[PDB]
């Protein structure tokens, strides 16, 4: 009738069809052409060393048993046909928890052409491992990978290819950036062979080059250390006899610095080494705690309890009014040129 001509085409395609066997099981290798359309590169979790990515993962392969001759060259079908045909067992090697979306229907695509060439697109949100080396935190850059390949079929059975040029086979969408801490610099693909206990498997790598934007850790920690050190520098311009004022000055600057040291290591994991921000934290601790030792030396070397023989201005404070701000100022030009410039 009207759609009976296509019904007897689909029922002829699926008659005597075994979806347990790959196309050309005993005669050839089932090549799979792959491209990824990244619709949103999601947030990167520093604490869990992971990242999120929403894709339009496409696979294409040739099936010799799905050839038809009809009034339509392409059969743009729904997803019930996809479960009744052979589809490759592509899985993500460094994935942690991925979701194939199915609201309101399963987000899949299936387009058989008249010679058997298939196209299989899916919506996935892949949470993948991005191992990080945070020795230059927060002025660091990472290359978060995304490896995928077959699970059961080895290199002699199913090989994977990019359908376009490899520089153009991973396309990130224009608005596809849910990144608020990093910014994506560019994608980078590679293809290789990985060996396991079962056999050798073709793996397709996609590296996403990320760079952290220091916009937050300035206002958050760097500038409170600068204001805490420059705060603890003006205690030398106070009176020599003023013991409670400079005493509470030193102890409150030490408390603000030692609570900056605690809050500094949050939302990044408990790594064994020390970051660049931790070295900065150590120096803005040293240049606060060295002021109070100077004040203790002055208080040991001071005399009468008023400001008759009046007291004299300390020589220790006059050098510390000049040496301590410049030894801070030389350090910041050394620290920021070492890490931020390279």
């Amino acid at each position, epitope marked *: 009738d009207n759609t009976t001509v296509f019904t007897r085409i689909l029922d002829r395609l699926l008659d005597g069809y075994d979806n347990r066997l790959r196309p050309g099981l005993g005669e050839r290798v089932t090549e799979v052409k792959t491209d990824i359309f990244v619709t949103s590169f999601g947030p990167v979790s520093d604490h869990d060393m992971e990242y999120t990515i929403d894709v339009f993962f496409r696979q294409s392969w040739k099936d010799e048993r799905l050839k038809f001759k009809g009034p339509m060259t392409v059969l743009r079908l729904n997803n019930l046909m996809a479960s009744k045909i052979w589809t490759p067992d592509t899985f993500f090697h460094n994935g942690k928890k991925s979701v194939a979306h199915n609201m309101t229907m399963p987000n899949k695509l299936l387009r058989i052409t008249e010679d058997g060439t298939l196209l299989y697109t899916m919506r996935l949100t892949v949470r993948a491992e991005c191992p990080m080396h945070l020795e230059d935190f927060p002025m660091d850059a990472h290359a978060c990978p995304l490896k995928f390949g077959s699970y059961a079929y080895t290199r002699a059975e199913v090989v994977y*290819e*990019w359908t376009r*040029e*490899p*520089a153009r086979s991973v396309v990130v969408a224009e608005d596809g950036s849910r990144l608020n801490q990093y910014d994506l610099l560019g994608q*980078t*693909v*590679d*293809s290789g062979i990985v060996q396991s206990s079962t056999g050798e498997y073709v793996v397709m790598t996609t590296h996403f080059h990320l760079k952290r934007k220091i916009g937050y850790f300035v206002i958050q920690t760097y500038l409170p250390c600068i204001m805490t050190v420059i705060l603890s520098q003006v205690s030398f311009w106070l009176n020599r006899e003023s013991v409670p004022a400079r005493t509470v000055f030193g102890v409150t600057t030490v408390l603000t610095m030692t609570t900056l040291s605690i809050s500094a290591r949050n939302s990044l994991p408990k790594v064994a080494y020390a970051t660049a921000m931790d070295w900065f934290i150590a120096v803005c601790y040293a240049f606060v705690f060295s002021a109070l030792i100077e004040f203790a030396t002055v208080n040991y070397f001071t005399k009468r309890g008023y400001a008759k023989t009046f007291n004299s201005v300390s020589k220790i404070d006059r050098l510390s009014r000049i040496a301590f701000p410049l030894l801070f100022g030389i350090f910041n030009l050394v620290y920021w040129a070492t890490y931020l410039n390279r």
Partner: antibody
Amino acid sequence: VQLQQSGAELVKPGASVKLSCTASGFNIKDTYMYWVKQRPEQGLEWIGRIDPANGDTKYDPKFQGKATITTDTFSNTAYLQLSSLTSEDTAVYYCARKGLRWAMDYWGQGTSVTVS
Amino acid sequence: NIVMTQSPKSMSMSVGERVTLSCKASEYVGTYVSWYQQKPEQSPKLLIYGASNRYTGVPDRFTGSGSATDFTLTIGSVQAEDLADYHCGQSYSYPTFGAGTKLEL
């Protein structure tokens, strides 16, 4: 499994020449078809790209305009169109099948063009 | 574009020793280079695909090697019938080629 090209061509400069190669043993709808230029005592220069299942073509920016690539399905054949031939276009041309891991597997025997 | 800068122009050694080539890439091509031989009056034949993958019919003496940017092709005990010209390509982007390394006695 065999890529058979046309014969040698000798035309005057400024004219146009049709150049072709027929692919056998497979179908050109699967793999990409590449064109490449080999000057005498020089290296290879890639001409352009064509996707016969799609019709999409991509060209070298130094070869844009003066050359275009066409194809057809029934004859399983790729074609070259060359316009405004000069002295530096005197070279030998090959058509390349895209193979395993984008490697230019098969090559034609080579058609050499000559201007005078 | 991607510029292939394979060196040197020609190597002149005898038969029965190890000879290596080199191909430097301007930008990243990741294990997508290829090596072809060019006999006089002959179409090119593929030798290595990927970075170091021996094609069918290639003898075992032809051992390539690859990386992200630096590439090389090592020949062990080169014979007299290998006296041809060698080309270096890439296909990570739109394909380019090198100048060409020849062999001499």
